[PDB]
PDB file of C-alpha atoms and ligand atoms in Angstrom:
ATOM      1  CA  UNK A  11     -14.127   1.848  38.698  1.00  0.00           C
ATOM      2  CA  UNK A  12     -13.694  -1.702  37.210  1.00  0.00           C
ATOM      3  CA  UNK A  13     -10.726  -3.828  39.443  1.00  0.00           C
ATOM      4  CA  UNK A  14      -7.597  -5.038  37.342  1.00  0.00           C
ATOM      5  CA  UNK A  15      -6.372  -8.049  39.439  1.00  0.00           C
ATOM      6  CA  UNK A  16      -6.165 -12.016  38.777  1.00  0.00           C
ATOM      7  CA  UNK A  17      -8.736 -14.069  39.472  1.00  0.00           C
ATOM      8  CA  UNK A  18      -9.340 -17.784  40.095  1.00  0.00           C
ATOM      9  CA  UNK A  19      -9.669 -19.684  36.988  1.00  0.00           C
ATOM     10  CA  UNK A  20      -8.898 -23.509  35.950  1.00  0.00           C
ATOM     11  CA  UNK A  21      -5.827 -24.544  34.510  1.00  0.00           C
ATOM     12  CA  UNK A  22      -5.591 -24.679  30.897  1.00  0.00           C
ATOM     13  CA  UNK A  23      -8.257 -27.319  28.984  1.00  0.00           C
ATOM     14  CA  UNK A  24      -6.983 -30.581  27.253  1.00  0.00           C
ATOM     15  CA  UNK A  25      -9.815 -30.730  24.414  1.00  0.00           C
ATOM     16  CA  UNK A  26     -10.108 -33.316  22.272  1.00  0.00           C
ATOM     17  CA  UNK A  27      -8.736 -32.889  18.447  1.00  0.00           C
ATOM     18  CA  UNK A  28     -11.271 -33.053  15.847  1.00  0.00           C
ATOM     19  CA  UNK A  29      -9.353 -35.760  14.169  1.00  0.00           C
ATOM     20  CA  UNK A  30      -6.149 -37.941  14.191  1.00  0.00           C
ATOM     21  CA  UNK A  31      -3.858 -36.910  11.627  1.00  0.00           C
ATOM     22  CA  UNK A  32       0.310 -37.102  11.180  1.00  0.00           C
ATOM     23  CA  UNK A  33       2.296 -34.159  12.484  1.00  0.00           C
ATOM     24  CA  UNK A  34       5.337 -33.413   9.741  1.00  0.00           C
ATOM     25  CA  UNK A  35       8.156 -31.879  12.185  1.00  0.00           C
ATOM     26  CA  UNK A  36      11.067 -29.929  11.238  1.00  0.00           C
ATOM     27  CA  UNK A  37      10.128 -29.070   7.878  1.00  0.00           C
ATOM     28  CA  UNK A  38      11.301 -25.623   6.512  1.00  0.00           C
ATOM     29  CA  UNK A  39      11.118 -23.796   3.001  1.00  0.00           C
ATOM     30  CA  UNK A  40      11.008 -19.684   1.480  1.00  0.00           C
ATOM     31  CA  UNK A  41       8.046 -18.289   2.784  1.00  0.00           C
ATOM     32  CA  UNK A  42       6.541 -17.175  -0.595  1.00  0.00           C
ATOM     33  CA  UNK A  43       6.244 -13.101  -1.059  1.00  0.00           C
ATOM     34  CA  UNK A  44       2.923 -11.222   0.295  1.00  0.00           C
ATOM     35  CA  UNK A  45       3.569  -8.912  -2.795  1.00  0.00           C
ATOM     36  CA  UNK A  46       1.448  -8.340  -5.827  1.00  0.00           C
ATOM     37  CA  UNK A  47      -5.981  -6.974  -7.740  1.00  0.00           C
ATOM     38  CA  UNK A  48      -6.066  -5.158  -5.373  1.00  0.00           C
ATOM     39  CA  UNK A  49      -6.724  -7.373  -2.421  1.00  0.00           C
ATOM     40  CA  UNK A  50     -10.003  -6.988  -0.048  1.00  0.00           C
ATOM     41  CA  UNK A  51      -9.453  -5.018   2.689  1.00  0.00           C
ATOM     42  CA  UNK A  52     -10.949  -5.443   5.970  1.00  0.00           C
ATOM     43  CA  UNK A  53     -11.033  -3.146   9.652  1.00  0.00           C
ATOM     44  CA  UNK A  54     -11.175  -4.725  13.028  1.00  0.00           C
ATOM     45  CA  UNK A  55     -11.365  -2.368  16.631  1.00  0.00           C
ATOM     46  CA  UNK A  56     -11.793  -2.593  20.126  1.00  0.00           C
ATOM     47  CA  UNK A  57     -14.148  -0.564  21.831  1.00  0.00           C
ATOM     48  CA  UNK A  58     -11.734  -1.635  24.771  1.00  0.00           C
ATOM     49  CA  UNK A  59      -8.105  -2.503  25.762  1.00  0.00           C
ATOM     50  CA  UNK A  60      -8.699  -5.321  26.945  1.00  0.00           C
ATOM     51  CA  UNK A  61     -11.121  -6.588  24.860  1.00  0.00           C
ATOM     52  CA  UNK A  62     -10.931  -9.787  22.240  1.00  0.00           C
ATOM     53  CA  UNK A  63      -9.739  -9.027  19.071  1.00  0.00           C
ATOM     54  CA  UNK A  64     -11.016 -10.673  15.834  1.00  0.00           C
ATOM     55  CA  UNK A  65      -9.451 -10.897  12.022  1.00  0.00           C
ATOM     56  CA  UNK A  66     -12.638 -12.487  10.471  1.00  0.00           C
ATOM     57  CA  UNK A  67     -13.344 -12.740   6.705  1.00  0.00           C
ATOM     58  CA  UNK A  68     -15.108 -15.730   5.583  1.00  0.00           C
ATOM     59  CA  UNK A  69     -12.474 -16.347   3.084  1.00  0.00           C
ATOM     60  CA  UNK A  70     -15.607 -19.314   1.135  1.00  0.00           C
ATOM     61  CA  UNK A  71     -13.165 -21.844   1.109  1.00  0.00           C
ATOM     62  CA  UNK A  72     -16.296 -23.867   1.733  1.00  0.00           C
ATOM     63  CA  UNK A  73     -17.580 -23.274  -2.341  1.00  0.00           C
ATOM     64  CA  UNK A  74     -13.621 -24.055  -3.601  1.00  0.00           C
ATOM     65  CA  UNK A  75     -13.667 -27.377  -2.133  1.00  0.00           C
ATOM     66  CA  UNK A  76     -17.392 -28.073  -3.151  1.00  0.00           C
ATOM     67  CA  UNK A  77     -16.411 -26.889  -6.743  1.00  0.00           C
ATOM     68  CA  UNK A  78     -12.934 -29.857  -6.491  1.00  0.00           C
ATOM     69  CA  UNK A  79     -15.861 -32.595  -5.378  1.00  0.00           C
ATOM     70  CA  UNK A  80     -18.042 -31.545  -8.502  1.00  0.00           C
ATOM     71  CA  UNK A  81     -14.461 -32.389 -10.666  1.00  0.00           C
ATOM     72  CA  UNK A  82     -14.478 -35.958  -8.954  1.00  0.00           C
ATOM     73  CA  UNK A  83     -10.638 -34.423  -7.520  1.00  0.00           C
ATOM     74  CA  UNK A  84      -9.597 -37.190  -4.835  1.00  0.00           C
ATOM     75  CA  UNK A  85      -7.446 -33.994  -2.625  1.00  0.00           C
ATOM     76  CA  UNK A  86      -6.753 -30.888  -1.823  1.00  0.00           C
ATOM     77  CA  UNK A  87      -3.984 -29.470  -0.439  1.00  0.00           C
ATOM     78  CA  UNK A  88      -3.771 -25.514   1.400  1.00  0.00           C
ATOM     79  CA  UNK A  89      -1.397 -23.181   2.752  1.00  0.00           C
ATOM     80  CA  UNK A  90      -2.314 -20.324   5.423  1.00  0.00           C
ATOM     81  CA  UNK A  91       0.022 -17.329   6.211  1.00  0.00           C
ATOM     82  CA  UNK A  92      -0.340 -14.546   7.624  1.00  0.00           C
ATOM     83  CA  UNK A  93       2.354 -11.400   7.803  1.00  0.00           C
ATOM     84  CA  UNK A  94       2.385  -7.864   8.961  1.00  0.00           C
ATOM     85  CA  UNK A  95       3.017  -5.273   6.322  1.00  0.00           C
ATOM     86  CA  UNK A  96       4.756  -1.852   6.910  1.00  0.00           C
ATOM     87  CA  UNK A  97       6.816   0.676   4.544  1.00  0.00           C
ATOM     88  CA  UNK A  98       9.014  -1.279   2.226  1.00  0.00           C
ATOM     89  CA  UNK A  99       8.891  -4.510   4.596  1.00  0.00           C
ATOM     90  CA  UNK A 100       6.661  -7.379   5.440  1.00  0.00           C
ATOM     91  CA  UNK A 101       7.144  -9.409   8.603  1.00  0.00           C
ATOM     92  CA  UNK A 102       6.061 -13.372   8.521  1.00  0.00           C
ATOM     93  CA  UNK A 103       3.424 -14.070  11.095  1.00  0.00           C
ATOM     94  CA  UNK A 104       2.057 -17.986  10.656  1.00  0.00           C
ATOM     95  CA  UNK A 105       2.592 -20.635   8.677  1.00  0.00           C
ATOM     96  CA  UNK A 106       0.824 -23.611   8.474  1.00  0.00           C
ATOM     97  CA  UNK A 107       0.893 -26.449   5.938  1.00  0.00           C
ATOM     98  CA  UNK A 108      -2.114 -28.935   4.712  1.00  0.00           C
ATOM     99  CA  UNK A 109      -1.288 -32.190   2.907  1.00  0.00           C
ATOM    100  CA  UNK A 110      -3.881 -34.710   1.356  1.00  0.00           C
ATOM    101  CA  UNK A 111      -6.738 -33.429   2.041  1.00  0.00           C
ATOM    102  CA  UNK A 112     -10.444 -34.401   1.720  1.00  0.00           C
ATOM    103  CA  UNK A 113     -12.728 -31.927  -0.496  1.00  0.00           C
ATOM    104  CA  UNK A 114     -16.058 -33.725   1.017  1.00  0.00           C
ATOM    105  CA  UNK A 115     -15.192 -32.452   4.618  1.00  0.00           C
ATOM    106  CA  UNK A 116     -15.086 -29.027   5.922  1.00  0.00           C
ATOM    107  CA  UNK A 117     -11.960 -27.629   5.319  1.00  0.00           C
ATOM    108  CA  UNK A 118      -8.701 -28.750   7.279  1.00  0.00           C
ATOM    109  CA  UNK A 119      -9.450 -33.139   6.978  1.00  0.00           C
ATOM    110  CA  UNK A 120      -6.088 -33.848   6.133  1.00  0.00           C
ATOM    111  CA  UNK A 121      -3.800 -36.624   6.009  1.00  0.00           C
ATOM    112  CA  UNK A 122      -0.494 -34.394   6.979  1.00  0.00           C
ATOM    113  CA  UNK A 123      -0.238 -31.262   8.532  1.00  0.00           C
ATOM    114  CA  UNK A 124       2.931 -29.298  10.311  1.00  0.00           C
ATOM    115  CA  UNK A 125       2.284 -27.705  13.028  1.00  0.00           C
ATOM    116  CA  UNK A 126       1.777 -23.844  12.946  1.00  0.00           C
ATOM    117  CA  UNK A 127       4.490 -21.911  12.205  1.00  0.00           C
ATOM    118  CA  UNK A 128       4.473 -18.991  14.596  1.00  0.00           C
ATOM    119  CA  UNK A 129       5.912 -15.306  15.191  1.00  0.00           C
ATOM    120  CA  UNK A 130       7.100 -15.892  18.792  1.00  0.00           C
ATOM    121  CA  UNK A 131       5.747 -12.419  20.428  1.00  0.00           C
ATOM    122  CA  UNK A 132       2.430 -13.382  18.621  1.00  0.00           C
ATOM    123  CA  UNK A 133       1.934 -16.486  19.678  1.00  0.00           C
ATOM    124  CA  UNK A 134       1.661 -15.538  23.411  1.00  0.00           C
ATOM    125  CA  UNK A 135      -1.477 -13.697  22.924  1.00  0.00           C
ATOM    126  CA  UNK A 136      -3.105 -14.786  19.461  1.00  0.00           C
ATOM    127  CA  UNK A 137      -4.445 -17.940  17.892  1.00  0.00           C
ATOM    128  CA  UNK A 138      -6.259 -19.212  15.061  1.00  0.00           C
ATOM    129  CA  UNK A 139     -10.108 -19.031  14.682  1.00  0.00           C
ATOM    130  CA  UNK A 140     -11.873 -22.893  15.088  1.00  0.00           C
ATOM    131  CA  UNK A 141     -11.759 -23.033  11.462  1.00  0.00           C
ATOM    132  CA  UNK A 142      -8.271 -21.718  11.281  1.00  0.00           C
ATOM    133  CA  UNK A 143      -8.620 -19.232   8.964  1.00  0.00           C
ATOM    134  CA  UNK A 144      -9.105 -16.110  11.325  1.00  0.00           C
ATOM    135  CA  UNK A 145      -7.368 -15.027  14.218  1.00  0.00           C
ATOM    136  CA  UNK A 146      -8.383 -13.803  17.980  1.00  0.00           C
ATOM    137  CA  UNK A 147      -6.042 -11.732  19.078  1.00  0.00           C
ATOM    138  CA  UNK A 148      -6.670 -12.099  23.268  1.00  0.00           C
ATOM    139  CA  UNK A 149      -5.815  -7.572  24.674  1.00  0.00           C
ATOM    140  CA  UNK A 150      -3.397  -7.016  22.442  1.00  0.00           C
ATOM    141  CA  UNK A 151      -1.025  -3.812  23.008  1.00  0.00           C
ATOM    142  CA  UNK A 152      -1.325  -1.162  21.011  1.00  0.00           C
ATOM    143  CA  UNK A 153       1.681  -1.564  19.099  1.00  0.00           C
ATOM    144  CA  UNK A 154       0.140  -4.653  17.520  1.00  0.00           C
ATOM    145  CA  UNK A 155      -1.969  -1.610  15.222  1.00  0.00           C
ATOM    146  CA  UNK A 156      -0.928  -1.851  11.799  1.00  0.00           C
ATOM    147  CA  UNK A 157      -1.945  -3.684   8.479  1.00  0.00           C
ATOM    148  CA  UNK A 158      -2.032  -7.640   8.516  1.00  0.00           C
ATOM    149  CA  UNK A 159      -2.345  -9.718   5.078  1.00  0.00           C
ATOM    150  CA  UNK A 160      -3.978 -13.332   5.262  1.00  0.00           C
ATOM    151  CA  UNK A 161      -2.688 -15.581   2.272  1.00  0.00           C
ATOM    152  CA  UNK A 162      -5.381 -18.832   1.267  1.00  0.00           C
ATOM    153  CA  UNK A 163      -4.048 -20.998  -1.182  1.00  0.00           C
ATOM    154  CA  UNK A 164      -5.786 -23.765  -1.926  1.00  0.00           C
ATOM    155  CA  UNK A 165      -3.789 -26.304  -4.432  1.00  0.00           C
ATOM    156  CA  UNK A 166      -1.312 -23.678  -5.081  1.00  0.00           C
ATOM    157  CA  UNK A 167      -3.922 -20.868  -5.524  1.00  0.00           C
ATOM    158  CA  UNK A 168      -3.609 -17.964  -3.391  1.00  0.00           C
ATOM    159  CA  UNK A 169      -5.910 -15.485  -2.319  1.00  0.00           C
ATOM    160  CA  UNK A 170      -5.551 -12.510  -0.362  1.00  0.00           C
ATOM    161  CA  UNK A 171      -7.171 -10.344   2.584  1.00  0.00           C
ATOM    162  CA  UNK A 172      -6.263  -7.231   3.978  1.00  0.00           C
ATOM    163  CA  UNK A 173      -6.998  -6.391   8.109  1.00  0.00           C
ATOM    164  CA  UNK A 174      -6.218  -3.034   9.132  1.00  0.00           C
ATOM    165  CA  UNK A 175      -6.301  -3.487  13.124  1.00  0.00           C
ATOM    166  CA  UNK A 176      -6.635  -0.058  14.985  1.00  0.00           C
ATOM    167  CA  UNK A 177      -6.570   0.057  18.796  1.00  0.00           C
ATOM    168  CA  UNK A 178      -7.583   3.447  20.130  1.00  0.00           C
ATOM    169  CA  UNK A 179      -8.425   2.585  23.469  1.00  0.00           C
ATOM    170  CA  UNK A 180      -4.655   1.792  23.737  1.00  0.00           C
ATOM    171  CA  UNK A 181      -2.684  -0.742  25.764  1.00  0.00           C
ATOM    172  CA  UNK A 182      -4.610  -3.108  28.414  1.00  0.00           C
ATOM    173  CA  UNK A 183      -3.240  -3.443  31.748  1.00  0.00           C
ATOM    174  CA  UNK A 184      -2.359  -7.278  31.370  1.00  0.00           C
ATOM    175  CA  UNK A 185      -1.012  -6.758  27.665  1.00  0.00           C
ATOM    176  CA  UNK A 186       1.851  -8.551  26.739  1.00  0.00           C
ATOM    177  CA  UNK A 187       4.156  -5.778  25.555  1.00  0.00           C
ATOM    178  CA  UNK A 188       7.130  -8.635  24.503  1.00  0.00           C
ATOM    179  CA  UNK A 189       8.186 -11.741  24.651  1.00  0.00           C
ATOM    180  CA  UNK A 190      11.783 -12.792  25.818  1.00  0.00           C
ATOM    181  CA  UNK A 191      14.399 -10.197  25.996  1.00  0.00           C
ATOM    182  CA  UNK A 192      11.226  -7.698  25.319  1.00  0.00           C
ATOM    183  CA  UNK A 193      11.331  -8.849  21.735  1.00  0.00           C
ATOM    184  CA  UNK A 194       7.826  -7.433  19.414  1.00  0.00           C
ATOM    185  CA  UNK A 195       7.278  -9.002  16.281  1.00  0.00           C
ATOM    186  CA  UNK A 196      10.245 -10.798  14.122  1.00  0.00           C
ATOM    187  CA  UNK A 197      12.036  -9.452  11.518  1.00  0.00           C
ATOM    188  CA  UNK A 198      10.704  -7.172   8.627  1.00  0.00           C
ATOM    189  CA  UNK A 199      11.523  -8.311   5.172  1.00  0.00           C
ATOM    190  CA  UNK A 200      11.537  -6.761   2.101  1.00  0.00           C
ATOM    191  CA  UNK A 201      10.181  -8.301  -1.470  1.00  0.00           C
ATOM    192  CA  UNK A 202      13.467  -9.460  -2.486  1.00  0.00           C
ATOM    193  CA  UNK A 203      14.839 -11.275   0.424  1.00  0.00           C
ATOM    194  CA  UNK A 204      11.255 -13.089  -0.008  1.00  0.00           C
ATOM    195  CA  UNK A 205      11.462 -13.425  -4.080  1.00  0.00           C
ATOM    196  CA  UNK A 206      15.044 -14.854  -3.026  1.00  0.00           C
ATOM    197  CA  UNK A 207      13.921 -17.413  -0.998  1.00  0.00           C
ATOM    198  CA  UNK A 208      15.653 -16.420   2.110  1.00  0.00           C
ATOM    199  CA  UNK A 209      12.802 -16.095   4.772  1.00  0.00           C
ATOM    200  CA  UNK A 210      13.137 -20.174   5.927  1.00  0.00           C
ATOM    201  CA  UNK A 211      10.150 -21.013   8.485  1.00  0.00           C
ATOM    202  CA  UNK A 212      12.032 -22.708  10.633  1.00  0.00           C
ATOM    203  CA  UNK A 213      14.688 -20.612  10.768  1.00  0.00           C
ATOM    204  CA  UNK A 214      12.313 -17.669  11.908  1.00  0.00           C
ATOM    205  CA  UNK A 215       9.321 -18.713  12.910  1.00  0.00           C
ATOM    206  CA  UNK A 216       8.531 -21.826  15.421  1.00  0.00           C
ATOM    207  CA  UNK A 217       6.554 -24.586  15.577  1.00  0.00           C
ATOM    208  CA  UNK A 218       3.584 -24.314  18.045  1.00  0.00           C
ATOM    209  CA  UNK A 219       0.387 -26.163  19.588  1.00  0.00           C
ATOM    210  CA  UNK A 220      -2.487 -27.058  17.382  1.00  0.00           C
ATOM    211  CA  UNK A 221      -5.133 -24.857  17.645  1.00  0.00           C
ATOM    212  CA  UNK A 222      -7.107 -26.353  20.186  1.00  0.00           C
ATOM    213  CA  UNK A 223      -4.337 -26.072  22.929  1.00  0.00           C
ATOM    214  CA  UNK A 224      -3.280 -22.294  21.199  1.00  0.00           C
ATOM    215  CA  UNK A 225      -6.667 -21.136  22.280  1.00  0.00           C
ATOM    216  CA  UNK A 226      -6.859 -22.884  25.776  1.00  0.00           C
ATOM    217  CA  UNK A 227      -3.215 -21.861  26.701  1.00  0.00           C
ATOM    218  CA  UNK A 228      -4.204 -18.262  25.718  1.00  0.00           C
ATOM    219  CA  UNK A 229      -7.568 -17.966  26.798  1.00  0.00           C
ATOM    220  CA  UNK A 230      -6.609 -19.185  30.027  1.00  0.00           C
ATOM    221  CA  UNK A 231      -3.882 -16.073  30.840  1.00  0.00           C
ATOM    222  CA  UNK A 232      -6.522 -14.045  29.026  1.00  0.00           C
ATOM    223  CA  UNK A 233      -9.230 -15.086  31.659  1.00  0.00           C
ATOM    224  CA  UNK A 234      -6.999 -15.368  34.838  1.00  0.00           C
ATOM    225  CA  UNK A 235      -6.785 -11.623  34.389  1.00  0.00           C
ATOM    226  CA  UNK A 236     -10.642 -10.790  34.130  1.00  0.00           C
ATOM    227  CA  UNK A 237     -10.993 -11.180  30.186  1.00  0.00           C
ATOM    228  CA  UNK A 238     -14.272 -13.273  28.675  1.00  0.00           C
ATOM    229  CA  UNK A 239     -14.001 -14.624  25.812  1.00  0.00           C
ATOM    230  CA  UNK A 240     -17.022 -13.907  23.333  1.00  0.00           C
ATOM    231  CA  UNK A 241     -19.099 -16.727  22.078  1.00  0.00           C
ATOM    232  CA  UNK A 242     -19.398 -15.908  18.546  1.00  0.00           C
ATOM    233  CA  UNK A 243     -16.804 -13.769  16.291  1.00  0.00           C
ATOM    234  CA  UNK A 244     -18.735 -11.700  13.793  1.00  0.00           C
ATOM    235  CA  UNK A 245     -17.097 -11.511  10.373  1.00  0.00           C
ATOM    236  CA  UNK A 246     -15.016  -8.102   9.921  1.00  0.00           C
ATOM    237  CA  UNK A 247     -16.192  -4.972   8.809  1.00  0.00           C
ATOM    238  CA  UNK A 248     -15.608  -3.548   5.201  1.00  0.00           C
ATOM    239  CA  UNK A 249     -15.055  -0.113   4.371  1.00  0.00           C
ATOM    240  CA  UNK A 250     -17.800   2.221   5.337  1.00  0.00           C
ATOM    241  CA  UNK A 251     -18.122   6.053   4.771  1.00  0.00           C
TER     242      UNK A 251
HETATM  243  C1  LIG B  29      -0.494 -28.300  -3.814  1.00  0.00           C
HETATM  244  O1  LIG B  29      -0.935 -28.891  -4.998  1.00  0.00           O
HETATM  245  C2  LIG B  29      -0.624 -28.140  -6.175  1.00  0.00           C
HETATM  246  C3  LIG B  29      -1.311 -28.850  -7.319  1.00  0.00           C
HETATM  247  O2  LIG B  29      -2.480 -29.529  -6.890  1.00  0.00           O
HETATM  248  C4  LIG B  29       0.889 -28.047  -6.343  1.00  0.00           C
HETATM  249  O3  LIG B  29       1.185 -27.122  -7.387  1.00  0.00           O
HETATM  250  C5  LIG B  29       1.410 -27.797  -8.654  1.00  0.00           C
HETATM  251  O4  LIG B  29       2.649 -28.541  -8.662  1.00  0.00           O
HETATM  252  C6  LIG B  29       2.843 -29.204  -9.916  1.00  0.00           C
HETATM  253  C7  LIG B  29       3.927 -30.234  -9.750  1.00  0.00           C
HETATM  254  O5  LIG B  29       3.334 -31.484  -9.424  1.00  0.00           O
HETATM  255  C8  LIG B  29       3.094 -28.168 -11.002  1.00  0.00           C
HETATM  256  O6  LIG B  29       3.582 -28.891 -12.138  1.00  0.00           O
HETATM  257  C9  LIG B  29       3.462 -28.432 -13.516  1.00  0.00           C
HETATM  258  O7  LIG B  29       3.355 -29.614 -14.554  1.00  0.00           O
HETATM  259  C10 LIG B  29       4.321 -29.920 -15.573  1.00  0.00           C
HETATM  260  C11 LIG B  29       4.417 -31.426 -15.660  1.00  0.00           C
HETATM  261  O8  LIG B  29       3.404 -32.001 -16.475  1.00  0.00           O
HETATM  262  C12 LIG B  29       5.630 -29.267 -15.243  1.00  0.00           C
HETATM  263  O9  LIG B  29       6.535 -29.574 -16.288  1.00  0.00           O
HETATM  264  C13 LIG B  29       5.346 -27.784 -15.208  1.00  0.00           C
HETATM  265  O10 LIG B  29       6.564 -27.062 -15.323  1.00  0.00           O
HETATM  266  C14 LIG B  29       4.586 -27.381 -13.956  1.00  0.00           C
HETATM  267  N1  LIG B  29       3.871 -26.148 -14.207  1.00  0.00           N
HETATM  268  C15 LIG B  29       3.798 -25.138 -13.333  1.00  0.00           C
HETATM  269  C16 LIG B  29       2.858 -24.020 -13.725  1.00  0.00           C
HETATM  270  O11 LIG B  29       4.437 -25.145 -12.252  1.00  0.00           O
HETATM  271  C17 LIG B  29       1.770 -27.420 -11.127  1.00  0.00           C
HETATM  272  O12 LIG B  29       1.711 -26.436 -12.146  1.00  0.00           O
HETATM  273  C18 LIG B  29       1.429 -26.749  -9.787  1.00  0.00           C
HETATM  274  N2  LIG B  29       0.152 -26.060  -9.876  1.00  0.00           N
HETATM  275  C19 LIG B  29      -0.163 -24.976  -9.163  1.00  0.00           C
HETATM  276  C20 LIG B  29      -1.525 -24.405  -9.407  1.00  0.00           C
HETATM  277  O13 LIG B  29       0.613 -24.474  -8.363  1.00  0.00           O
HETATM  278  C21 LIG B  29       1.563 -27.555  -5.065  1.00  0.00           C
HETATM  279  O14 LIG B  29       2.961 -27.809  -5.149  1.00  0.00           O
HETATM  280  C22 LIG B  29       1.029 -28.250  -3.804  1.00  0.00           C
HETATM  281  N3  LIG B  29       1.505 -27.562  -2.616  1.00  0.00           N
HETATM  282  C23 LIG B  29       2.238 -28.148  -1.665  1.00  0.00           C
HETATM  283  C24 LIG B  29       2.638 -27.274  -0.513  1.00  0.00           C
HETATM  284  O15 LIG B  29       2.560 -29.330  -1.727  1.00  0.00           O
HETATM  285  C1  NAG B  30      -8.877 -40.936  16.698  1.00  0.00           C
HETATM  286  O1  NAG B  30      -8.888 -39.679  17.297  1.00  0.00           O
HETATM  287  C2  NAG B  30     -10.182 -39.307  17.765  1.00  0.00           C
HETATM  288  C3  NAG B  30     -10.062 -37.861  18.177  1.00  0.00           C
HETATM  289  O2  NAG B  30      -8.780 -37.353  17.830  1.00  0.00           O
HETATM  290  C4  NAG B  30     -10.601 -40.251  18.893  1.00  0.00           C
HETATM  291  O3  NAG B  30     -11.940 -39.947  19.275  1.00  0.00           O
HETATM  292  C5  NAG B  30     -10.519 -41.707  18.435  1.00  0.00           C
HETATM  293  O4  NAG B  30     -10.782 -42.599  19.511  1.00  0.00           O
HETATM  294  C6  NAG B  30      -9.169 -42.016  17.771  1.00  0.00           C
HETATM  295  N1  NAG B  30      -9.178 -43.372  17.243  1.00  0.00           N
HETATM  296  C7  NAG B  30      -8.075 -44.093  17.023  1.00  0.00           C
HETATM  297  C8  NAG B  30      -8.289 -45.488  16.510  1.00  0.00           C
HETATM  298  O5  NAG B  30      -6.958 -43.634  17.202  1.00  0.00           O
END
């Protein structure tokens, strides 16, 4: 019978950034609509509650950006968002912004970035991948089961992934069942507030730690309650009869 207690850990890690780059505060604008061929669809378990949680789909932004260099193109520039869809509604999850970037790195070199736009529930439990197009999602509770939609675009170009997250083994001891006032996830939308231009970042999501703190701060509470974190993510599984 396994012990659920706290257990001695070090504070949260300081790493290094990959790179210096300008932070562009207090920016806001319409998150665009997640709606409408048809979009890859992805599953991702945990054989326990307490277990890390991974939304992994190699999404090759690695042949786009060789494909710009073979056009002699001087930037790129990239959007990543992620929402929650339900009946009718879709709920705005992350938002994060890339501005002049350069095609002959790995993806994310760029000149300007905001910082991540988060759902504040989220963010207490859940970061982005090292190459910040996946997300670990550190015991989540089982109301976090549902459908989530990732959203590339690369120079305006969008592409689309589907995770359908399914947590059987239930809530984890240490789950975070809410943030303040026991608030779950924001606000659901539906396509026409979005197609109206009426879900503003700033004005419902918030701007958060680069990913290099997100995963320390949240590893951190995940480990001072037992939790390892794994060293590799494998890419999610498709549909399988
Ligand atoms: C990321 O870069 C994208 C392009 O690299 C930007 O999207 C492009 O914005 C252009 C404006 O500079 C659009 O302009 C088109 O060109 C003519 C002018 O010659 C206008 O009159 C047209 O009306 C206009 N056409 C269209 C189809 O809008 C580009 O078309 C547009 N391209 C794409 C693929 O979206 C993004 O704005 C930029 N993203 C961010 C966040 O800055
Ligand atoms: C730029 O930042 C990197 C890491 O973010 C650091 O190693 C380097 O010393 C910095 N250089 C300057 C000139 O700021």
């Amino acid at each position: 019978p396994a012990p659920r207690v706290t257990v001695y850990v070090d504070p949260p890690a300081y790493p290094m950034p990959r790179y210096n780059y300008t932070e562009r505060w207090h920016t806001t604008g319409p998150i665009p609509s997640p709606f409408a061929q048809p979009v890859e669809v992805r599953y991702a378990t945990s054989a326990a509650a307490c277990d890390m949680l991974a939304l992994i789909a190699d999404p090759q932004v690695g042949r786009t950006l060789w494909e710009a260099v073979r056009r002699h193109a001087r930037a790129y520039n990239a959007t990543v968002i992620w929402y929650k869809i339900e009946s009718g509604c879709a709920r705005p999850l992350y938002y994060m912004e890339y501005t002049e970037c350069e095609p002959r790195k790995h993806f994310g070199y760029c000149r300007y970035r905001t910082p991540p736009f988060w759902d504040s529930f989220l963010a207490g439990f859940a970061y982005p991948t090292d190459d910040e197009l996946g997300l670990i999602m550190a015991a989540p509770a089982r109301l976090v089961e549902g459908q989530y939609r990732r959203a590339l675009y690369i120079d305006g170009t969008v592409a689309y992934t589907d995770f359908m997250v399914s947590l059987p083994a239930g809530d984890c001891w240490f789950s975070k069942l809410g943030a303040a006032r026991g608030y779950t996830f924001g606000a659901c939308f539906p396509a026409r507030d979005y197609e109206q231009k009426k879900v503003l970042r700033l004005t419902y999501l918030t701007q958060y730690y680069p990913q290099e703190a997100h995963k320390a701060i949240v590893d951190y509470w995940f480990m001072r309650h037992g939790g390892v974190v794994p060293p590799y993510f494998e890419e999610s599984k498709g549909y399988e009869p």
